[PDB]
Curated annotation (Swiss-Prot):
It is found in: Secreted, Extracellular space, Extracellular matrix; Nucleus; Cytoplasm. The lineage of its organism: Eukaryota, Metazoa, Chordata, Craniata, Vertebrata. The chain holds residues 100 to 267 of 477 of the full protein. Its main location: secreted. The gene is MMP3. This is Stromelysin-1. It is linked to Coronary heart disease 6: A multifactorial disease characterized by an imbalance between myocardial functional requirements and the capacity of the coronary vessels to supply sufficient blood flow. Decreased capacity of the coronary vessels is often associated with thickening and loss of elasticity of the coronary arteries.
Amino acid sequence: FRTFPGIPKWRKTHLTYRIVNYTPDLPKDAVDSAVEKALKVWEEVTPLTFSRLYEGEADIMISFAVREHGDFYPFDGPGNVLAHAYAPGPGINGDAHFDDDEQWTKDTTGTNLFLVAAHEIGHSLGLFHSANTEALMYPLYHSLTDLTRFRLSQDDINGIQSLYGPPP
Ligand SMILES: [Ca+2]
Ligand SMILES: [Ca+2]
Ligand SMILES: [Ca+2]
Ligand SMILES: [Pt+2]
Ligand SMILES: [Zn+2]
Ligand SMILES: [Zn+2]
């Protein structure tokens, strides 16, 4: 696994998130579920905990955007870059942006929202890309036969625990 340079990490264990807007691709329920599950994957193996905010500024602001959307890194239309997220810190740091020129799915027929969110949240928490191909943090989007037995790899667990420790 890899962390970001200087090992930027959150310096509190309780983090807030907010879902700023919703893709037309999916029911709102399936967006909330995918995000909740992606946060849970990391919560399970650390002492971090998350709560949703419906107004004000949360640590991890989550949104769907296309092309120019408010930062210096425009999205690129269908395929290729699916989403991007910033390392831990104030303001835009921590935030995760999802390219709505992708077709977001609950399953693996388009681009799976849970899997890409779990990966991007890994960045929001301080993990950079892994060299390990089995790792959630490996760069490459991997459709893969069966999301149902999804497991974070030991590599992902090792990286995130190197930052925040194991559950208490
Ligand atoms: Ca933020
Ligand atoms: Ca794209
Ligand atoms: Ca879309
Ligand atoms: Pt915000
Ligand atoms: Zn962005
Ligand atoms: Zn990545």
